[PDB]
Amino acid sequence: ELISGGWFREENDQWPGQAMSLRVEKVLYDAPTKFQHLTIFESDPKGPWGTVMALDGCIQVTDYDEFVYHEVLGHTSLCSHPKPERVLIIGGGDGGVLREVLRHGTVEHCDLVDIDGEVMEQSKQHFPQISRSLADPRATVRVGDGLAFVRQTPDNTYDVVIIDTTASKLAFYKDVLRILKPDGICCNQGESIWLDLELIEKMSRFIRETGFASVQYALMHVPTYSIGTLVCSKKAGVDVTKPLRPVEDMPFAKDLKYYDSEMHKASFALPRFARHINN
Amino acid sequence: GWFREENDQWPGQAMSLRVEKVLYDAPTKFQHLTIFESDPKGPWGTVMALDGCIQVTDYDEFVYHEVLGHTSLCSHPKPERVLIIGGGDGGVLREVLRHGTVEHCDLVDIDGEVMEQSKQHFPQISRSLADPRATVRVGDGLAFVRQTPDNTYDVVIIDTTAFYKDVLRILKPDGICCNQGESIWLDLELIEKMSRFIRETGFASVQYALMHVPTYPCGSIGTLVCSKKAGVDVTKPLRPVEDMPFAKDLKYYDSEMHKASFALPRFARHINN
Ligand SMILES: C[S@@H](CCCN)C[C@H]1O[C@@H](n2cnc3c(N)ncnc32)[C@H](O)[C@@H]1O
Ligand SMILES: C[S@@H](CCCN)C[C@H]1O[C@@H](n2cnc3c(N)ncnc32)[C@H](O)[C@@H]1O
Ligand SMILES: COc1ccc(Nc2ccnc3ccccc23)cc1
Ligand SMILES: COc1ccc(Nc2ccnc3ccccc23)cc1
């Protein structure tokens, strides 16, 4: 339904009476998928955004800002683990998180499971700088439901599980805890302290009560939206807020556009109204 | 009935709010002033825009107000006399006046209509304007500082929409200056140029602090925190807010947030070194 020269409009049920719009230079994809509406377009070349992906009317990836959420999810988790060798990504069909995971020399294998094979296909076509990772021999990329995937995973399979999703069931957290090895780290796309503070409070407590030893929420600075990540440790006495394996000691630190150890530490400082999430 | 905000810096992008009720909409002697009640099912409440750019909403005003007010004052060893340039809504002043060390604050905003419309439509922001420790003037900040004697202020806060040499001059030796600092998203070249312009006018140091706002279509909002005295580290609170009686009244700012605010994404880090 979208056309070139028209505007893409984004609205939110949580924030009614607000809309965010982008001019569409060129439609690249606009169709229902087996699971969701997929919209890819080139935004205004006078603007900074580049190619833009939306799922069910909500922007999920742009060329300009993708490095933020990808670096944060990939490095805050892996740098909190003593030796991450086996990694699971749930969602992340675009490849961004996987690219960041694969920078780490300790990773021998990463499994990626995204329900929507068309997201992965369209990302190969229209976001090669994000999706190149999906071809890596250190990765196995599967089309399937992450819920069923973790249910059929044996105990103690993964060092890190990263949940990079949009959907709504993501019982599941008990499976995640079970498939993690004893030093395990889980991290998730965490929702907004502005939109959904009560949800973060709720999720944080239900994750701890599932049996995770600790859960800390990290905030990120994106150019437009808040977005956070819940970083969960299976093992008691882990402080995920200070990098266990600082990125600065690894050869790729200087390739990163957002993340470093100072950013990692700062991300866990929350505005005072939300600070009770982390204590 | 939707208010739409666009930027020349960000072409092909727009942010819109539904207008529930127009409260004020007229040219002023200096700028277009628009005040509206936004959607009561949304979180924003009353919204003020100047020349088509939103400057204040009931919902988020605490962020920029607390950050400008406290990052500066907690970076000063004993802030007694404070100047605010702009800030006609009263938000920064309200924050500055929480500090017990403050004996007097002058506030100078070019547009008297902004203070009048804030008195009417943002009483929880503009209450401060009536405080006996405050003197409010309607006038240009540039001319005001030009006619201010040397070593008058402990802190100058620039809360707006040669001057800097006058700001440096009117500051006492431990003086702190802070300004509404613009977005590291695209707008980065300007912050870099501002920070160099400020150091070269003779401030000893300039550090940029980032804030987390619920929406900013212009990218991000920050503050440049500048110290007249050499060897001051404005990135670590000199007088922690936690030692003061009003710390728990704050909705955003604390010492953790103060320290964190100066940690910049890698691409922008060269702003602060
Ligand atoms: C695009 S990614 C979000 C953008 C940040 N890279 C969101 C992905 O999660 C997938 N997703 C949603 N639900 C699931 C389940 N249940 N399992 C796996 N992947 C899922 C969905 O297909 C998106 O590609
Ligand atoms: C509303 S405040 C915006 C930030 C939200 N506290 C911006 C104020 O700066 C004033 N302003 C703009 N230029 C000047 C000058 N030159 N002098 C004083 N005040 C000024 C303008 O009238 C706004 O009220
Ligand atoms: C999950 O990682 C993220 C993090 C941030 C975004 N940001 C944006 C959301 C919606 N519309 C936009 C429009 C333009 C730019 C960014 C956005 C999306 C996914
Ligand atoms: C001086 O500091 C600030 C900081 C933040 C804003 N916020 C908003 C700016 C622009 N459009 C919006 C649209 C909707 C909501 C908020 C905003 C203004 C001034």
From TrEMBL, chain A:
Active-site residues, Swiss-Prot/TrEMBL: 164
Family: Belongs to the spermidine/spermine synthase family.
GO BP, sorted A to Z: spermidine biosynthetic process
Residue ranges occupied by any PABS domain in the UniProt entry: 5-234
MF (Gene Ontology): spermidine synthase activity
Keyword S-adenosyl-L-methionine: yes
Keywords carried by this UniProt record: Polyamine biosynthesis, S-adenosyl-L-methionine, Transferase
GO cellular component: cytosol
Domain of life where this protein originates: Eukaryota
Species: Trypanosoma cruzi (strain CL Brener)
Entry binding sites for S-adenosyl-L-methionine 1: 36, 114, 145-146, 165
EC numbers for this chain: 2.5.1.16
Protein name as annotated: Spermidine synthase, putative
Binding site for S-adenosyl-L-methionine 2: 36, 114, 145-146, 189
Disulfide bond annotation, renumbered to this chain: 186-232
